[PDB]
Design an enzyme around this catalytic site. Structure first.
Site, PDB file in Angstrom:
ATOM      1  N   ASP A 162      10.396  63.755  49.886  1.00  0.00           N
ATOM      2  CA  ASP A 162      10.898  63.461  51.228  1.00  0.00           C
ATOM      3  C   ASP A 162      10.811  64.721  52.094  1.00  0.00           C
ATOM      4  O   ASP A 162      10.533  65.804  51.586  1.00  0.00           O
ATOM      5  CB  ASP A 162      12.379  63.061  51.069  1.00  0.00           C
ATOM      6  CG  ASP A 162      12.995  62.431  52.315  1.00  0.00           C
ATOM      7  OD1 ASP A 162      12.299  62.197  53.330  1.00  0.00           O
ATOM      8  OD2 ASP A 162      14.212  62.147  52.258  1.00  0.00           O
ATOM      9  N   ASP A 221      14.438  60.390  69.977  1.00  0.00           N
ATOM     10  CA  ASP A 221      14.428  61.791  69.571  1.00  0.00           C
ATOM     11  C   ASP A 221      13.024  62.396  69.720  1.00  0.00           C
ATOM     12  O   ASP A 221      12.321  62.617  68.740  1.00  0.00           O
ATOM     13  CB  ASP A 221      14.913  61.890  68.125  1.00  0.00           C
ATOM     14  CG  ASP A 221      15.232  63.308  67.698  1.00  0.00           C
ATOM     15  OD1 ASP A 221      15.238  64.227  68.552  1.00  0.00           O
ATOM     16  OD2 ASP A 221      15.476  63.496  66.494  1.00  0.00           O
ATOM     17  N   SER A 252      12.250  69.038  60.727  1.00  0.00           N
ATOM     18  CA  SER A 252      12.523  68.366  62.001  1.00  0.00           C
ATOM     19  C   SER A 252      11.549  68.734  63.086  1.00  0.00           C
ATOM     20  O   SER A 252      11.201  69.897  63.243  1.00  0.00           O
ATOM     21  CB  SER A 252      13.937  68.696  62.485  1.00  0.00           C
ATOM     22  OG  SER A 252      14.906  68.060  61.667  1.00  0.00           O
ATOM     23  N   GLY A 253      11.132  67.735  63.852  1.00  0.00           N
ATOM     24  CA  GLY A 253      10.197  67.962  64.928  1.00  0.00           C
ATOM     25  C   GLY A 253       8.752  67.949  64.462  1.00  0.00           C
ATOM     26  O   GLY A 253       7.848  67.830  65.283  1.00  0.00           O
ATOM     27  N   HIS A 292      16.179  66.800  69.474  1.00  0.00           N
ATOM     28  CA  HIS A 292      17.318  67.485  68.871  1.00  0.00           C
ATOM     29  C   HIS A 292      17.021  68.938  68.495  1.00  0.00           C
ATOM     30  O   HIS A 292      17.910  69.648  68.029  1.00  0.00           O
ATOM     31  CB  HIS A 292      17.891  66.692  67.677  1.00  0.00           C
ATOM     32  CG  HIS A 292      17.167  66.904  66.378  1.00  0.00           C
ATOM     33  ND1 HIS A 292      16.380  65.938  65.802  1.00  0.00           N
ATOM     34  CD2 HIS A 292      17.167  67.956  65.519  1.00  0.00           C
ATOM     35  CE1 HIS A 292      15.918  66.379  64.639  1.00  0.00           C
ATOM     36  NE2 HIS A 292      16.381  67.591  64.449  1.00  0.00           N
ATOM     37  N   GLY A 302      14.684  71.587  58.266  1.00  0.00           N
ATOM     38  CA  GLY A 302      13.696  72.585  58.628  1.00  0.00           C
ATOM     39  C   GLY A 302      12.362  71.940  58.937  1.00  0.00           C
ATOM     40  O   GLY A 302      11.468  72.604  59.463  1.00  0.00           O
ATOM     41  N   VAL A 355       4.747  86.188  56.865  1.00  0.00           N
ATOM     42  CA  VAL A 355       3.775  87.271  56.803  1.00  0.00           C
ATOM     43  C   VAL A 355       2.683  87.086  57.852  1.00  0.00           C
ATOM     44  O   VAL A 355       1.974  86.084  57.832  1.00  0.00           O
ATOM     45  CB  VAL A 355       3.097  87.328  55.400  1.00  0.00           C
ATOM     46  CG1 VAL A 355       2.038  88.416  55.363  1.00  0.00           C
ATOM     47  CG2 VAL A 355       4.134  87.568  54.316  1.00  0.00           C
TER      48      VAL A 355
HETATM   49  C1  LIG Z   1      15.674  68.815  60.744  1.00  0.00           C
HETATM   50  O1  LIG Z   1      14.768  69.622  60.058  1.00  0.00           O
HETATM   51  C2  LIG Z   1      16.307  67.686  59.908  1.00  0.00           C
HETATM   52  C3  LIG Z   1      15.309  66.848  59.103  1.00  0.00           C
HETATM   53  C4  LIG Z   1      15.986  66.065  57.996  1.00  0.00           C
HETATM   54  C5  LIG Z   1      15.061  65.091  57.299  1.00  0.00           C
HETATM   55  N1  LIG Z   1      15.747  64.463  56.172  1.00  0.00           N
HETATM   56  C6  LIG Z   1      15.240  63.493  55.424  1.00  0.00           C
HETATM   57  N2  LIG Z   1      14.017  63.036  55.672  1.00  0.00           N
HETATM   58  N3  LIG Z   1      15.953  62.992  54.421  1.00  0.00           N
HETATM   59  N4  LIG Z   1      17.106  66.800  60.739  1.00  0.00           N
HETATM   60  C7  LIG Z   1      18.433  66.840  60.733  1.00  0.00           C
HETATM   61  O2  LIG Z   1      19.087  67.662  60.077  1.00  0.00           O
HETATM   62  C8  LIG Z   1      19.133  65.799  61.598  1.00  0.00           C
HETATM   63  C9  LIG Z   1      19.510  66.371  62.951  1.00  0.00           C
HETATM   64  C10 LIG Z   1      20.983  66.626  62.954  1.00  0.00           C
HETATM   65  C11 LIG Z   1      21.581  65.624  61.991  1.00  0.00           C
HETATM   66  N5  LIG Z   1      20.435  65.418  61.035  1.00  0.00           N
HETATM   67  C12 LIG Z   1      20.551  64.947  59.784  1.00  0.00           C
HETATM   68  O3  LIG Z   1      19.571  64.550  59.136  1.00  0.00           O
HETATM   69  C13 LIG Z   1      21.945  64.947  59.170  1.00  0.00           C
HETATM   70  N6  LIG Z   1      22.136  63.708  58.428  1.00  0.00           N
HETATM   71  C14 LIG Z   1      23.323  63.335  57.956  1.00  0.00           C
HETATM   72  O4  LIG Z   1      24.351  64.015  58.063  1.00  0.00           O
HETATM   73  C15 LIG Z   1      22.101  66.160  58.247  1.00  0.00           C
HETATM   74  N7  LIG Z   1      21.618  67.373  58.899  1.00  0.00           N
HETATM   75  C16 LIG Z   1      22.210  68.555  58.817  1.00  0.00           C
HETATM   76  O5  LIG Z   1      23.349  68.699  58.385  1.00  0.00           O
HETATM   77  C17 LIG Z   1      21.441  69.717  59.273  1.00  0.00           C
HETATM   78  C18 LIG Z   1      22.028  70.917  59.282  1.00  0.00           C
HETATM   79  C19 LIG Z   1      21.287  72.190  59.564  1.00  0.00           C
HETATM   80  C20 LIG Z   1      22.258  73.296  60.002  1.00  0.00           C
HETATM   81  C21 LIG Z   1      22.950  72.976  61.306  1.00  0.00           C
HETATM   82  C22 LIG Z   1      22.356  73.355  62.495  1.00  0.00           C
HETATM   83  C23 LIG Z   1      22.950  73.045  63.701  1.00  0.00           C
HETATM   84  C24 LIG Z   1      24.144  72.355  63.697  1.00  0.00           C
HETATM   85  O6  LIG Z   1      24.707  72.058  64.835  1.00  0.00           O
HETATM   86  C25 LIG Z   1      24.751  71.974  62.514  1.00  0.00           C
HETATM   87  C26 LIG Z   1      24.149  72.289  61.310  1.00  0.00           C
HETATM   88  N8  LIG Z   1      20.286  71.948  60.596  1.00  0.00           N
HETATM   89  C27 LIG Z   1      18.995  72.125  60.354  1.00  0.00           C
HETATM   90  O7  LIG Z   1      18.573  72.571  59.288  1.00  0.00           O
HETATM   91  C28 LIG Z   1      18.024  71.689  61.448  1.00  0.00           C
HETATM   92  C29 LIG Z   1      17.220  72.892  61.944  1.00  0.00           C
HETATM   93  C30 LIG Z   1      18.056  73.869  62.747  1.00  0.00           C
HETATM   94  C31 LIG Z   1      18.521  73.512  64.004  1.00  0.00           C
HETATM   95  C32 LIG Z   1      19.266  74.418  64.745  1.00  0.00           C
HETATM   96  C33 LIG Z   1      19.541  75.676  64.231  1.00  0.00           C
HETATM   97  C34 LIG Z   1      19.074  76.027  62.974  1.00  0.00           C
HETATM   98  C35 LIG Z   1      18.331  75.126  62.230  1.00  0.00           C
HETATM   99  N9  LIG Z   1      17.118  70.705  60.868  1.00  0.00           N
HETATM  100  C36 LIG Z   1      16.767  69.598  61.507  1.00  0.00           C
HETATM  101  O8  LIG Z   1      17.270  69.240  62.569  1.00  0.00           O
END
Ligand SMILES: *[C@]1(=O)[C]([C][C][C][N]C([N])=[N])[N]C(=O)[C]2[C][C][C]N2C(=O)[C]([N][C]=O)[C][N]C(=O)/[C]=[C]/[C]([C]C2=[C][C]=C([O])[C]=[C]2)[N]C(=O)[C]([C]C2=[C][C]=[C][C]=[C]2)[N]C1=O
Length: 223
Positions: free
Chosen positions: A171, A84, A177-178, A40, A175, A57
């Protein structure tokens, strides 16, 4: 990482940062020119950053290498986040030293109760928004599948496992993720998803790496 602590510079040498103008996902170095991360987190034109501690930095110790190719698992499903996992081949092999090193793939799956180290540069707040400069770490056990399934009814597959604390407080988070979940020196998980962050009965869900070792090796040997 919510409720973690500062890892300490270069103490998690296999941790990498996936950058596309900014840090968006983590990853793990498994070979001089291969890193594994979450499917993802797929993006085109990814620059992998190795030997990183303070992502904001330049400390001279890091290595920036562009991704040559990204191979997402053939059964990755964006709707459920099943499978994933993805492999990223580096444009150039990394200079493996002390501050940069690969993590071993597991030979068997880790049992519930196994203590692991989770790390990343993700959000440190349950509600707020605060991304750390330096790498954060957290020690958390792998939870039993029954506990995992009861926390996330109908959402857990055989390719996922829960890790963390059922009472919340600590937890992984947005950010992270991966990123890696290393248990006893072996990469057992990849930060995937969760409902919120550090919430009671909503532990983090991670890709079960032990189910993909054959796929990983085969992919490396033919690419
Ligand atoms: C990952 O860093 C996270 C890790 C979450 C671990 N949580 C925990 N242990 N309790 N993974 C996710 O966010 C995953 C993938 C997508 C759906 N995820 C969820 O966990 C969702 N769960 C329930 O709703 C909630 N996630 C979000 O809302 C994440 C939003 C943000 C911003 C965003 C980016 C792209 C979109 O299309 C929509 C919203 N996403 C992140 O912070 C991403 C990192 C990222 C990706 C792409 C561009 C910029 C930042 N974080 C992760 O995937």
């Amino acid at each position: 990482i919510v409720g973690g602590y500062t890892c300490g510079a270069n103490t998690v040498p296999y941790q990498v940062s996936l950058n596309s103008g900014y840090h968006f996902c983590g990853g793990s170095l498994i070979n001089s020119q291969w890193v594994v991360s979450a499917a993802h987190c797929y993006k085109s034109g990814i620059q992998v950053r190795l030997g990183e501690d303070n992502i904001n930095v330049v400390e001279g110790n890091e290595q920036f290498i562009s991704a040559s190719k990204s191979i997402v698992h053939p059964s990755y499903n964006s709707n459920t986040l099943n499978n994933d996992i993805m492999l990223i081949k580096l444009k150039s092999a990394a200079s493996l030293n002390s501050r940069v090193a690969s993590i071993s793939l597991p030979t068997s799956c880790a049992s519930a109760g196994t203590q692991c180290l989770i790390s990343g540069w993700g959000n440190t707040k349950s509600s707020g928004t605060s991304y750390p400069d330096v790498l954060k770490c957290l020690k958390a056990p792998i939870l039993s599948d029954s506990s995992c399934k009861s926390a996330y009814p109908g959402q857990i597959t055989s390719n996922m496992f829960c890790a963390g604390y059922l009472e919340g407080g600590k937890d992984s988070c947005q950010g992270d993720s991966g990123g890696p979940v290393v248990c006893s020196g072996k990469l057992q998980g990849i930060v995937s998803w969760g409902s919120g962050c550090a919430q009671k009965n909503k532990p983090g869900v991670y890709t079960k790496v032990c189910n993909y070792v054959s796929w990983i090796k085969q992919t490396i040997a033919s690419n």
